[PDB]
Paper text:
Here, we have sought to generate high-resolution crystallographic structures of the cellular interacting fiber-knob domains of species D adenoviruses HAdV-D26 and HAdV-D48. The fiber-knob is the receptor interacting domain of the fiber protein, one of three major capsid proteins along with the hexon and penton base, as shown schematically in Fig. 1a. We next calculated the amino acid variability at each position in the aligned adenoviral fiber-knob sequences, which revealed regions of broad conservation corresponding to β-strands which make up the main fold of the fiber-knob trimer. Each monomer interacts with two neighbouring copies to form a homotrimer with 3-fold symmetry and a highly stable interface. Analysis of the adenovirus loops reveals an intricate network of polar interactions which stabilise their three-dimensional structures.
Numbering used by the authors:
A (entry chain A), B (entry chain A), C (entry chain A): 2 to 196
Write the structure that this text describes.
């Protein structure tokens, strides 16, 4: 088989935030049985977040954006994802000139560990019987790889509607950045796999 | 064998902070030879930390709590842990209707890498010859999965006295939370295994 | 083979920041195919950062330092690294009284994922076509394992000149520490491997 499903190395951009080939997403999933081991970088090369300036454009919509990975019931990427299908496959093996095939359910984030979330009660004083938060990793990345340029990053599992599985990346910051390209330090986490 | 030792999926709560079935701890250990790969979520469903309000209860004891995993010399959970033994076993395999057995030493945190810590010198100006900190991962979780609701989380290895190995989770915050359920984003780290 | 390449357990110090045996670096690499799984602790036992006091020594050079791992084209440590070669090998196996040998290319950080970085344009307004940040994990450690004692830590891949591969650890803080030994909580991340 192959145990690593990733963003094939091409010099080309492969991702759309607002416009086609906005961005070059690096994303690597390596399977350790029950946990998938994730690593991700993001470079946005044109559009609103290549060179950010919030002194100029300070409205909320210029300080957050989202990226969506959307899979079918067999773990194949759907057209409507942010990531272009052509740049997403397993690593080498008998998948070198076997080219873009799939099944990949063992790389999907468990619908048991990460279910469709319930509807939060009417009263927020009322405590939950089951978790709204448990499908989110909330961490940071650093633009330019500089400690001074944080971007709050929320990875969320199986919360999108297009699909059967989903990995969603929601970035957002408060710092009023002045001329700073969105070019991220990498983020590493792990998640519970389906089978 | 099985390589993943975890909190069996049950809708039921499985953990005690102050009272029996206070809390529903999700905790997954996946073994990659020398490193154990950990993932953890926490939902507290009744007690002091289901709905936190520190405008009402502002004393130090309402802004910190602890969870303890305690193992014997073979890597079996002891009764006195926060986590209920009945909800802790390997993942499926020949352990589906083989039910709660164990040995699990390869999932234990190394007593060589994480020893009983020495006694810190009389003078704190005096520098150490061996580490007090090296058995702690110190990170955060996010209540509601919201960047604005951090909780400082200190995972500590083999520091408890009941036992032969130990994984301890010490949560604590300064934010004066007003009506906020302790429902955590997940935390991922790795640790050095025994054998 | 062996899948874990690490800092052999010895009570002795094994690392040089400014002077020989300054420091006792714990560092463990465990290979999961395409990703290397890293874990690191640091104790500095003499020199400037055993007992830090920035009320006394407040200049920039007393609030940052660096550690370098430098490998040849086969993944062998070079003399000039911060880490002493004698304390760095695979874990047991047929490498117990086979002693210090190597090849270890599969533990090296990919020169495809982590290349020699390009030269940042003349104008910083000009947006990049390829990433300057993508070879850095930027995170923290906690001196004494205390949430109140952060140290910003930047792990950087293949940026040094002595060598063919490199893992570099750049620590730095703003807090004016008063009498606090540099004794770190551990840091865990993963990185993309070569082959």
């Amino acid at each position: 088989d192959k145990l690593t499903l990733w963003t094939t190395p091409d010099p080309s951009p492969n991702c759309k935030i607002d416009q086609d080939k906005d961005s070059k997403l690096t994303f690597v999933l390596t399977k350790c049985g029950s946990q998938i081991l994730a690593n991700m970088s993001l470079l946005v090369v044109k559009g609103k977040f290549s060179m950010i300036n919030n002194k100029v454009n300070g409205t909320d919509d210029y300080k957050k954006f989202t990226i969506k990975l959307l899979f079918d019931e067999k773990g194949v990427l759907l057209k409507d994802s942010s990531l272009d299908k052509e740049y997403w496959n397993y690593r080498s093996n008998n998948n070198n000139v076997g080219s873009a095939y799939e099944e990949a359910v063992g790389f999907m984030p468990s619908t048991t560990a990460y279910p469709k979330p319930p509807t939060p009660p009417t009263n927020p004083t009322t405590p939950l019987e089951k978790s709204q938060a448990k499908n989110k990793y909330v961490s940071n990345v650093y633009l330019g790889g500089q400690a001074g340029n944080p971007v709050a990053t929320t990875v969320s599992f199986n919360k999108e509607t297009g699909c059967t599985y989903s990995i969603t990346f929601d970035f957002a910051w408060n710092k009023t950045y002045e001329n700073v390209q969105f070019d991220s330090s990498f983020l590493t986490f792990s998640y519970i796999a389906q089978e």
